[PDB]
Amino acid sequence: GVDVEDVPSAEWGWSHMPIGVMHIGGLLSAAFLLVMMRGNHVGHVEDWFLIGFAAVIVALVGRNWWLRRRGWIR
Amino acid sequence: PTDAELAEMSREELVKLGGKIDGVETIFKEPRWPVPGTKAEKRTERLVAYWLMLGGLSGLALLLVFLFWPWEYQPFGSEGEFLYSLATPLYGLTFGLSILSIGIGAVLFQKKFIPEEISVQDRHDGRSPEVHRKTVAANLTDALEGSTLKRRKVIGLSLGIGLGAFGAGTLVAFIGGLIKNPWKPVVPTAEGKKAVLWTSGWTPRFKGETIYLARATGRESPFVKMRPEDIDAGGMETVFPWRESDGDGTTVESEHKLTEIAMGVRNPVMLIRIKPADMHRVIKRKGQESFNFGELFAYTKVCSHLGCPSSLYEQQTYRILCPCHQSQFDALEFAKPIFGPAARALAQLPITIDEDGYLVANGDFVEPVGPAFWERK
Amino acid sequence: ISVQDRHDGRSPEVHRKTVAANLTDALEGSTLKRRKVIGLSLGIGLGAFGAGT
Amino acid sequence: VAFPRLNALSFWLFLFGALIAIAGFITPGGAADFGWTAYSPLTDAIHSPGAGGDLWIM
Amino acid sequence: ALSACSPPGETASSEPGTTPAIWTGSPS
Amino acid sequence: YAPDLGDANPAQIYTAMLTGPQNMPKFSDRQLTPDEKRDIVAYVRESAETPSYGGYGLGGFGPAPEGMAMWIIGMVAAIGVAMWIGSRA
Amino acid sequence: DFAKLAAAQGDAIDSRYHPSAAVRRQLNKVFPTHWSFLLGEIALYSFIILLLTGVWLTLFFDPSMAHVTYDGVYQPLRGVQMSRAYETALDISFEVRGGLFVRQVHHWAALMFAASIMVHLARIFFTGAFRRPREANWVIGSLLLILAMFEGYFGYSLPDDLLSGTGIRAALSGITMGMPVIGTWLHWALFGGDFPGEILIPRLYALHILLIPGIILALIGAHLALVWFQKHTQFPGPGRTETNVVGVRVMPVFAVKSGAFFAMITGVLGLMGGLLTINPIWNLGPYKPSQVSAGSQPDFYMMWTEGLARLWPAWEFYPFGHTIPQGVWVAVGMGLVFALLIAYPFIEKKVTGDDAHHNLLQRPRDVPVRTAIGSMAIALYLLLTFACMNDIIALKFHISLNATTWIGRIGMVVLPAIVYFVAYRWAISLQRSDREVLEHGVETGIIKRLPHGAYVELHQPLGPVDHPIPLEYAGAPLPKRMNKLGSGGAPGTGSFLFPDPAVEHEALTEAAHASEHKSLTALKEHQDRIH
Amino acid sequence: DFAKLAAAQGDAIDSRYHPSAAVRRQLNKVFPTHWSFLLGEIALYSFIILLLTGVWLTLFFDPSMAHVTYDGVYQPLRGVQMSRAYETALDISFEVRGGLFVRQVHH
Amino acid sequence: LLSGTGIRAALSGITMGMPVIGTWLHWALFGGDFPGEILIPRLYALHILLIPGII
Ligand SMILES: CCCCCCCCCCCCCCCC(=O)O[C@H](COC(=O)CCCCCCC[C@@H](C)CCCCCCCCC)COP(=O)(O)O[C@H]1[C@H](O)[C@H](O)[C@@H](O)[C@@H](O)[C@@H]1O
Ligand SMILES: CCCCCCCCCCCCCCCC(=O)O[C@H](COC(=O)CCCCCCC[C@@H](C)CCCCCCCCC)COP(=O)(O)O[C@H]1[C@H](O)[C@H](O)[C@@H](O)[C@@H](O)[C@@H]1O
Ligand SMILES: CC(C)=CCC/C(C)=C/CC/C(C)=C/CC/C(C)=C/CC/C(C)=C/CC/C(C)=C/CC/C(C)=C/CC1=C(C)C(=O)c2ccccc2C1=O
Ligand code: HEM
Ligand code: HEM
Ligand code: FES
């Protein structure tokens, strides 16, 4: 799924992962970080850390998906 | 090659022929010291010799140190404890040094004197030649077809049935000695016979049994009754279910009972005296509103996650902590798990005092104590 | 009723000659025979380690 | 530059020293809380005894 | 990787409860 | 945390048992009798002052420093020896 | 005198068993000489140590859970009630000359066995040696890894001390008890009843000295038989091809190298068993269900499991009248991991459709996706391992326990993704560096200022020049320093203090140069002729 | 089904390991049929049994010389000082289903 | 009782009675006098692992 210009040694071994796997992986990782807010803990600093990391992951996935959908990123 | 011309081959030619038979061609092999009579060869020979000699002298040191060093354990803070502490490091030093030096000498001999070679072997892998594959397939098919088992369905069906039945019977008669019902009532109780997982040493046995909270003195009479004023506020105690009929460790049956109560996995109880200035902060569990005796609460010392002793009492936070997986229960909220992988509260033991004033258990745990299982709740 | 040939006793001469050639070639090309000190120290060290162990 | 590898060494020493000094927040006592000037008696083992100050120093 | 469930029998209370009575033990 | 007990003289151990400062349970003179307290003091001092017999005590914590030592000494040395014996490419 | 004896013994052996053809075949077998192909051998040699010391330990160990009073030589446990296994372990450590040394060598050998199995697995996975025809050999290796993990677990559980007993109670009891339908049945089949039983230690002793060692011995035998008759893989190189093996014959280079490596590994293990303390049981005391210690961690090859149990967030289920505890997750976790380790070659075969016979290894940089996955798995394993040790990390490095717990929880998601991304880009960038070297030639580090002011670097082409003709990548490593191609010259021969006469220097240097040219020429002729 | 499956399994085995020549050499090995040449076989087969039952016995035996009081089901020995090994042998005989049978088959 | 009598008569008496190294062999094997504590475990390790492995 890659070209010699992108991955020089593409003929030699497995060198492409479909972007769907990465996109759903990011969404699932964000969902896991969010769902970890349900549990047993008095404090709420960890909830904000989870929310921030989930936001960063969702932002990265959204930007990558948007740029592949518009043509800039391939 | 014939015997006559084999008789007239040099050793190098014979090695070449032998390698060629096996599929191996040594395309390079040259002596390590082509130039005779140099000082560098002498130096390398003496280096290998010195490494092997160090190995020999270290083996001798191993023999001598093992035989003659003072090895017997020496008590704390006495003379001869330094030599005892050095005993085992000296065995390790001598043994490892000897064998490591021998290995180094062997590596150096290989790298410096054994001629460097580059041999090439043919793999001959993948599919077998068609003659071998066809002959082996024909042999197997001929066995199966001459057996005639295919055209005899009654014999094949009977053979399958019999072998399967014998295998099933043997497997059952093999594993069956290990299979134990965990719910066979074997433990007496003031309500009949009950399963082990439903009971502990705190379970009363004759409907009015006085079970004392006994501290472990860690000594003849390792357990003793204790009074509520024997715990200062903010202090923690590990108590065990001890009855009058258990004894004091003198007689052998008394020691057996005391051992069996000290080794009960669900026996230990954590007894904590809350400071009164914090007794307003106590939130009580439904159905356990009357299990504490004033400032003294009693909980199980068995974590509800995986059964480790949650035995770290932080008084200024009233937090029970289990070191196995870092669970935190709030002792002010009926030992509710506030952190970690624990999701169930620690059981609370009802306690009171008897006529003499000694702390006793006011009944049994109102739930199973240790880690959860299928049949819980 | 099947009959198989033993093919036992000594090996064919080619195999014996080539095996002897390979083994003596190893021992000779290693040149350990003309290293008296290396051989002696190897024997002493191996024996010392064996006795100690 | 005169020493191209010593240059990269300087940069990485920068990065890792800065990270070490900032990692004092990870400590429960917190990072250095005695100012950037680090005046003497306030910085002793008695006054400001946490580990964030030691990470600051190193 | 799923959600959490509280134990059905682990609720809190508001009743303060009575102080435990002095204990007496049957002879056997 | 609960600190390392090695550098503490007996009176500090005794008074730490006797008056639990912070998140230490308080061990009164009837919960822990003076003879019990002295036995605990003796054991703590003995454990602080005893040298390791098997060699170098890797901090006295157990399998964590042991695994770190194996990965950083034993495995490093083994891999280095393999690199010396073997070849690259 | 010994030549006649050797000839007569060989004649007798050949007349009686006629092994000449087979022995010659085994002596001429060619093994590649890469250093990484030695990694597996470490796991072999330590295992042999584990046998030897193990047999020694069987002469003094009584694996009885019966309770006795010590009355030994160790004063700080005099009069303490302990099991018979703990007392016999104490007697080994104190009452038998060299018993402590044998115990420590045994435990260190177990640790090296596990670690070397892990490093060998990394080699096999990243080089792609699990590919056809070597999938079953990967399956056998994975089974050996699991068996070694559990064998070491049972081993250090054998002396019933506080730490090992706490580990038994946590893992082998709590996790087993909580399994959905058969958990209590498994627990009562294994322990014979409740956890603090009377049969556990003898059963584990039988499993650990006889059953699991026998299974591992049979699996290692089958493993090495497969490696021997499915000849070793190799990296692409000058004289290498899918249909050959380039290296050294067994006699005598390979045999001497393997023996010397065995001796050196035994030396390392002996030195560590003497100079470093491992599992000082007498400091822990006998196991007691009422006591536990702050530093509760297993041997490192199990640590990840505990880390998982430390990080998974208290997720339990309550179906109709039944409880599914948190520990169940951990069990499933392990299962999945082991499953995902056993069937990896088939997963990659399905995903990439690559079902071709492969004898030439792959450099990890040439397979960026598999390298990224392997780095991801290594990062996750390391994170779980350190999360197991987060109490010690919290104590030594000032950080709160909740901080390490939440760092681990968030990390087991964030860190593997970052490591995947970095590894993928790093592998492709290594590919690009290889291409740059192949297309411009090696950078020699020498800068010239041309008369018009041009600062140029001197490039050393690896092939002919027209500027070099760009060579084609052939899956092999490339030189990037000039000292590695011989430009650094040779020092004056001597003894590091005194030179040899210049005639001897000339003779040796000329002979070595001629030999190097002869070796390269032979490889070049073989490469040219075969291709 | 079980013909094409056998052919496919044979092809896969031969492509991965190419044992056809060696396997055929093992299938064509001729063995004399005299009855006495079976005697050694007996010594092998019983040995295999000794392994299997033997492993079973290791799941319940405790090899200790520590003194215990029996306290079991077999009445004629209750309250008798014995060793832990003798106690667990009695437990194999009486407490485990098929334990006595496995013991007797093993001996 | 029967196998213990057999151990005493053969493994102990004959081993003890041998010349020069007899009692040394007995005390190495039994770890002391005949009614030792490391005899049954030693025989168990010889019998389930060592001798079956050699065999
Ligand atoms: C590949 C395996 C395929 C075959 C598996 C073997 C067949 C399973 C059933 C066993 C056959 C029955 C033999 C006796 C079983 C029987 O009938 O048990 C009764 C209650 O069974 C029942 O209703 C049915 C049992 C339900 C099975 C539950 C499945 C859980 C399994 C999967 C988990 C165990 C895993 C074992 C792994 C081994 C770990 C160790 C390496 C009540 O026990 P209990 O009243 O305590 O009395 C005890 C005497 O039974 C008993 O012999 C004993 O010897 C006496 O001491 C006595 O305690
Ligand atoms: C293979 C090399 C090993 C050489 C062994 C060969 C030596 C031959 C004989 C060995 C005899 C044993 C040595 C002395 C006997 C001895 O044990 O001395 C301990 C001293 O220990 C220390 O700290 C000193 C640390 C200095 C050692 C540095 C070497 C450590 C290496 C092996 C670590 C490398 C791995 C790095 C891992 C991370 C790298 C990756 C990032 C006592 O320290 P102490 O002052 O009492 O405090 C303790 C506290 O835990 C506490 O304070 C407590 O209160 C005290 O009770 C006492 O335990
Ligand atoms: C989980 C986490 C975030 C931890 C952070 C704590 C920490 C190390 C903070 C340092 C400050 C920071 C973040 C600096 C960043 C700059 C960088 C890249 C620094 C790199 C240097 C680092 C991080 C070194 C730490 C290495 C580390 C954490 C190792 C694990 C600790 C282990 C396994 C200790 C085991 C161990 C112990 C505990 C002993 O007591 C002992 C005693 C005697 C001999 C050996 C040992 C021994 O090996
Ligand atoms: C892969 C193989 C093996 C591994 C990983 C392993 C691992 C271990 C470990 C880590 C210990 C703890 C020792 C201590 O802490 O003192 C142990 C104990 C023990 N091992 Fe092994 N072992 C293996 C094979 C064997 C074999 C083959 C035997 C017997 C022939 C054996 C006999 C013993 C005995 C008797 C003990 C308990 C005695 C003691 O702890 O001192 N082991 N094992
Ligand atoms: C040539 C091989 C073997 C022989 C001749 C042999 C012989 C015997 C005999 C005669 C007994 C007495 C049985 C009784 O009176 O109850 C016994 C007991 C025992 N055997 Fe073996 N055995 C052999 C191999 C094995 C193996 C391989 C194991 C373990 C894998 C094993 C495990 C045991 C155990 C644990 C006992 C004691 C349990 C009991 O006495 O009930 N044996 N052996
Ligand atoms: S057993 Fe207490 S947290 Fe796991």
Exposure string of B66-104, with b = 16+ CB inside 10 Å and e = fewer, is beebebebbeeeeeebeebbbbbbbbbbbbbbbbbbbbb
Residue G389 contacts residue G272 (beta carbons within 8 Å): no
Q: Any idea how long chain F is?
A: 89
How was this one solved? cryo-EM
* Six-digit token string for G63: 């694996």
Chain H residues near residue C1 by CB distance under 8 angstroms: none
Asked if B88 and F30 come within 8 Å (Cβ–Cβ), the reply is no
B212 close contact with F: CB closer than 8 A: no
Ligand nearest to the CA of B300: 6
Measured in angstroms, the resolution is 3.1
Chains A and H touch (3+ CB pairs under 8 A): no
In sequence order, what DSSP letters do the residues of G239-299 get, joined into one string?
A: S--TTEEEEEEIIIIIHHHHHHHHHHHHHHHHHHHHHB----GGGT-B--TT---S-----
Residue G25 contacts residue G242 (beta carbons within 8 Å): no
Amino acid at C42: L
The torsion defined by the Cα of B322, B326, B331 and B332, in degrees rounded to 10, comes to 180
Ligand 6 pocket test, pick from B321, B322, B328, B338 with the greatest ligand atom count within 8 Å of Cβ, gives B322
End-to-end CA distance of chain F: 51
Least Cα distance to G379 among G321, G320, G420 occurs for G420
Alpha helices in B176-206 (DSSP H): none
Give the chains touching H; criterion: ≥3 Cβ pairs < 8 Å.
Answer: B, C, G, I
| DSSP-derived 3-state class of residue E19 | coil
C-alpha span between D41 and G65 (Å, rounded) = 59
Those residues whose C-beta lies under 8 Å from the C-beta of residue G453, and which sit 6 or more positions away, are none
In this structure, is the dihedral angle defined by the CA atoms of residues B304, B306, B309 and B313, taken in order, positive or negative?
negative
Specify the pairing of strand G442-449 against strand G244-249: unpaired
Q: Is B303 in the pocket of ligand 6 (CB under 6 A)?
A: yes
Ligand nearest to the CA of G205: 4
Atom of ligand 4 nearest to the CA of G113: 5
Residue D35 contacts residue D12 (beta carbons within 8 Å): no
Q: Is G12 in the pocket of ligand 3 (CB under 6 A)?
A: no
What is the distance in A from the centroid of ligand 4 to the CA of G106?
6
For I23-32, the CB contacts below 8 A with 24+ separation are none
What is the distance in A from the centroid of ligand 6 to the CA of F78?
37
What angle separates helix G99-127 from helix F75-85, to the nearest 10 degrees? 60
Chains C and I touch (3+ CB pairs under 8 A): no
Q: Is the omega angle on the peptide bond into residue F25 within 30 degrees of 0, that is, cis?
A: no
Cα dist from G198 to G65, H62, H96, H98, whole Å: 6, 9, 15, 20
Cα dist from H65 to G81, G84, G176, G201, whole Å: 17, 10, 31, 15
Give the chains touching I; criterion: ≥3 Cβ pairs < 8 Å.
Answer: G, H
C-alpha span between G499 and B43 (Å, rounded) = 12
Please name the residue of chain D whose CA is at the shortest distance from the CA of residue G393.
D27
In sequence order, what DSSP letters do the residues of G432-472 get, joined into one string?
A: HHHHHHHHH-EEEEEEEE-TTS-EEEEEE-SS-B--BPPP-
Please name the residue of chain I whose CA is at the shortest distance from the CA of residue G213.
I49
Chains G and D touch (3+ CB pairs under 8 A): yes
Q: Is G110 in the pocket of ligand 3 (CB under 6 A)?
A: no
C-alpha span between B89 and B69 (Å, rounded) = 11
Q: Is residue B42 within a helix (H) or strand (E), and if so which, with residue range?
A: helix B39-68
Q: Any idea how long chain G is?
A: 531
Asked if B28 and G519 come within 8 Å (Cβ–Cβ), the reply is yes
Ligand 3 pocket test, pick from D20, D25, D27, D54 with the greatest ligand atom count within 8 Å of Cβ, gives D20
Count CA atoms within 13 Å of residue G437 on its CB side: 17
Q: Any idea how long chain B is?
A: 377
Please name the residue of chain E whose CA is at the shortest distance from the CA of residue G312.
E1
Amino acid at G291: Q
| DSSP-derived 3-state class of residue G499 | strand
Cα dist from G182 to B373, G110, G188, whole Å: 10, 32, 10
Ligand 3 pocket test, pick from D16, D56, D57, D58 with the greatest ligand atom count within 8 Å of Cβ, gives D16
Residue E19 contacts residue B294 (beta carbons within 8 Å): yes
C-alpha span between B297 and B313 (Å, rounded) = 13
Question: How far is CA G86 from its chain centroid?
Answer: 31
C-alpha span between G150 and G156 (Å, rounded) = 10
* Six-digit token string for G426: 């790093």
Q: Any idea how long chain E is?
A: 28
Q: Is residue B298 within a helix (H) or strand (E), and if so which, with residue range?
A: strand B296-300
Q: Is residue H52 within a helix (H) or strand (E), and if so which, with residue range?
A: helix H39-58
Closest partner CB to G315 (pick from E4, E7, E8): E4
C-alpha span between G79 and B267 (Å, rounded) = 23
* Ligand 5, atom 16, residue with closest C-alpha: H103
Q: Is G90 in the pocket of ligand 4 (CB under 6 A)?
A: no
* Six-digit token string for G46: 């330590």
Least Cα distance to G222 among G150, G144, G116, G124 occurs for G144
What is the distance in A from the centroid of ligand 4 to the CA of G163?
16
Please name the residue of chain H whose CA is at the shortest distance from the CA of residue I40.
H63
Ligand nearest to the CA of H51: 5
Q: Other CB atoms closer than 10 Å to residue G177's CB: what's the count?
A: 26
Closest partner CB to A42 (pick from B338, B340, B343): B338
Separation in Å, CA of G181 to nearest CA in chain F: 34
Least Cα distance to B120 among B230, B188, B23, B33 occurs for B23
Question: How far is CA G360 from its chain centroid?
Answer: 22
Specify the pairing of strand G455-460 against strand G442-449: antiparallel
The Cα diameter of chain F in Å comes to: 73
Please name the residue of chain A whose CA is at the shortest distance from the CA of residue E6.
A39
C-alpha span between F30 and F36 (Å, rounded) = 10
Burial of B21 (0-12, 13-18, 19+ CB in 10 A): middle
Asked if A49 and G473 come within 8 Å (Cβ–Cβ), the reply is no
* Six-digit token string for G175: 């996790």
What is the distance in A from the centroid of ligand 3 to the CA of G352?
40
C-alpha span between B352 and B249 (Å, rounded) = 26
* Six-digit token string for G142: 């994975």
Atom of ligand 1 nearest to the CA of G188: 34
In this structure, is the dihedral angle defined by the CA atoms of residues C33, C35, C40 and C46, taken in order, positive or negative?
negative
Those residues whose C-beta lies under 8 Å from the C-beta of residue G298, and which sit 6 or more positions away, are F63, G153, G156, G167, G171, G305, G306, G388
Amino acid at B29: K
Those residues whose C-beta lies under 8 Å from the C-beta of residue G384, and which sit 6 or more positions away, are G303, G304, G305, G307, G308, G311, G408, G412
C-alpha span between B95 and G266 (Å, rounded) = 9
Separation in Å, CA of E3 to nearest CA in chain B: 13
What is the distance in A from the centroid of ligand 2 to the CA of F51?
10
Rg (CA), chain F: 22
